[PDB]
Amino acid sequence: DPELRSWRHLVCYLCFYGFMAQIRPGESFITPYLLGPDKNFTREQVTNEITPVLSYSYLAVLVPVFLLTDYLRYTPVLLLQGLSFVSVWLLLLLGHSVAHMQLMELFYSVTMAARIAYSSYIFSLVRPARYQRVAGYSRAAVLLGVFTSSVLGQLLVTVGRVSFSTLNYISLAFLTFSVVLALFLKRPKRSLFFNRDDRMLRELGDSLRRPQLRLWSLWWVFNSAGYYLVVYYVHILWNEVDPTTNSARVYNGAADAASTLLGAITSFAAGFVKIRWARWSKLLIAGVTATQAGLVFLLAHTRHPSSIWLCYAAFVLFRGSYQFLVPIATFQIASSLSKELCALVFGVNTFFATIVKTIITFIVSDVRGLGLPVRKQFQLYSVYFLILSIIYFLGAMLDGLR
Numbered sequence: 001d002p003e004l005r006s007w008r009h010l011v012c013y014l015c016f017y018g019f020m021a022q023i024r025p026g027e028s029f030i031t032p033y034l035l036g037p038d039k040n041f042t043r044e045q046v047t048n049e050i051t052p053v054l055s056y057s058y059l060a061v062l063v064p065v066f067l068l069t070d071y072l073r074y075t076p077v078l079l080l081q082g083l084s085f086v087s088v089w090l091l092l093l094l095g096h097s098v099a100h101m102q103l104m105e106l107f108y109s110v111t112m113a114a115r116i117a118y119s120s121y122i123f124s125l126v127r128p129a130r131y132q133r134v135a136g137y138s139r140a141a142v143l144l145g146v147f148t149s150s151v152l153g154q155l156l157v158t159v160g161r162v163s164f165s166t167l168n169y170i171s172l173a174f175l176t177f178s179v180v181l182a183l184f185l186k187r188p189k190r191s192l193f194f195n196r197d198d199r200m201l202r203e204l205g206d207s208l209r210r211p212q213l214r215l216w217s218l219w220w221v222f223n224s225a226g227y228y229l230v231v232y233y234v235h236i237l238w239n240e241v242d243p244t245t246n247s248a249r250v251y252n253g254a255a256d257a258a259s260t261l262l263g264a265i266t267s268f269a270a271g272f273v274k275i276r277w278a279r280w281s282k283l284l285i286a287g288v289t290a291t292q293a294g295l296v297f298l299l300a301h302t303r304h305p306s307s308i309w310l311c312y313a314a315f316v317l318f319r320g321s322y323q324f325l326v327p328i329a330t331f332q333i334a335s336s337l338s339k340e341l342c343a344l345v346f347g348v349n350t351f352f353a354t355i356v357k358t359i360i361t362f363i364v365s366d367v368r369g370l371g372l373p374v375r376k377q378f379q380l381y382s383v384y385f386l387i388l389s390i391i392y393f394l395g396a397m398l399d400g401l402r
């Protein structure tokens with residue numbers, strides 16, 4: 001039966017690749033592996049030389065991987081994302097120098113640029129009458145797969161007492177299997193821009209006059225340029241708060257699973273907020289950004305190794321508060337946008353957020369710029385979120401006055 005094969009062999013394989021491609025158990029523990037006894041990097045060498053090229057190359061590969069995903073019909077970039085995740089874990093386990101780890105974060109930004117591959121693959125594959133059910137099953141498989149990767153990464157180092165190098169070998173076994181699964185993915189017969197089955201500047205300029213598309217895209221290019229700077233460097237900060245060498249009380253996987261679990265809760269709890277709290281939208285940003293300005297300052301202030309579990313809660317609540325706004329951000333941006341225009345508005349919001357993130361990494365974090373340590377960067381990121389929270393708060397009172 002063609003309808004029965006379309007669910008028992010294609011949707012069940014879409015969700016299985018959506019589950020298995022997220023399984024990287026040693027992904028939360030990359031930075032304790034770099035700063036551990038195995039690779040033996042200095043904390044001033046990961047913060048200022050290895051991690052700022054995670055933002056440099058992400059600016060370099062965002063425009064190619066956005067165009068090569070639509071031109072190659074979304075499957076070989078899903079194969080390239082698996083083949084770049086292998087090259088990350090190969091350079092983790094075979095590279096010893098800093099240029100190998102700057103090449104490791106080069107390929108890690110190709111995987112970050114190809115996160116747009118899988119969610120836009122389900123759109124061009126599935127018929128639009130059955131798309132929202134398959135995409136609902138597919139996003140519920142990458143949500144379970146991201147959560148159970150960090151749980152499996154946490155249960156091996158803590159319950160199993162597995163070393164970090166043996167964890168990255170288990171993570172290589174789950175990643176070459178994700179390359180094999182990406183070869184058997186059904187290629188879609190259409191795409192969004194270059195391969196269409198069978199104006200956009202006119203539809204953009206009309207929708208650019210919307211008060212919520214201009215507000216929440218200016219949130220996207222400044223708050224996500226500061227959200228993605230904390231999540232690059234909070235694993236270097238936890239190696240300054242509690243610089244342990246146990247590899248069993250590291251707990252970076254439980255903080256990346258609780259930020260997925262709570263982040264899915266606030267993502268779901270923001271579904272009732274996308275339409276109701278839509279006019280009070282500059283005050284809703286300013287309430288969350290000031291919460292993000294205090295949680296980053298709480299990360300920047302905590303220095304005792306006994307208080308490391310305050311730094312885990314100050315990051316789960318940080319990612320849980322950012323994931324309260326995305327739901328509201330993507331709804332108000334993509335409310336009256338065409339789907340071909342929605343992929344380009346989010347394609348330039350993610351690009352201009354990378355433009356800002358490249359500016360702040362070169363000034364604050366890079367050794368060719370200033371080269372601040374990771375505790376002094378987080379004081380600068382806290383004052384970045386504070387002078388951003390008062391801009392939307394003054395905007396909530398300038399428009400609240402009228």
Ligand SMILES: Nc1ncnc2c1ncn2[C@@H]1O[C@@H]2COP(=O)(O)O[C@H]3[C@@H](O)[C@H](n4cnc5c(N)ncnc54)O[C@@H]3COP(=O)(O)O[C@H]2[C@H]1O
Binds near residue numbers: 116263267327330331
């Ligand atoms: N409309 C929405 N409703 C509820 N939650 C939302 C949401 N949009 C984003 N989130 C949450 O924000 C996180 C990062 O979003 P970002 O768009 O910057 O980076 C995204 C984006 O580049 C891409 N992506 C996700 N969904 C997409 C979609 N429907 N269409 C195109 N690209 C998508 O994957 C990355 C991470 O997605 P992931 O969900 O694992 O992680 C997402 C998700 O948990």
Ligand SMILES: Nc1ncnc2c1ncn2[C@@H]1O[C@@H]2COP(=O)(O)O[C@H]3[C@@H](O)[C@H](n4cnc5c(N)ncnc54)O[C@@H]3COP(=O)(O)O[C@H]2[C@H]1O
Binds near residue numbers: 331
């Ligand atoms: N992180 C992201 N990066 C770039 N673009 C993004 C994005 N998240 C959503 N978009 C785009 O915004 C459109 C409307 O988002 P909405 O949140 O209202 O309704 C969304 C949202 O509730 C949900 N959703 C989308 N991405 C999600 C994610 N990463 N995690 C959980 N739910 C997601 O699917 C619904 C329709 O998605 P669809 O693609 O057909 O249409 C989506 C999608 O193309």
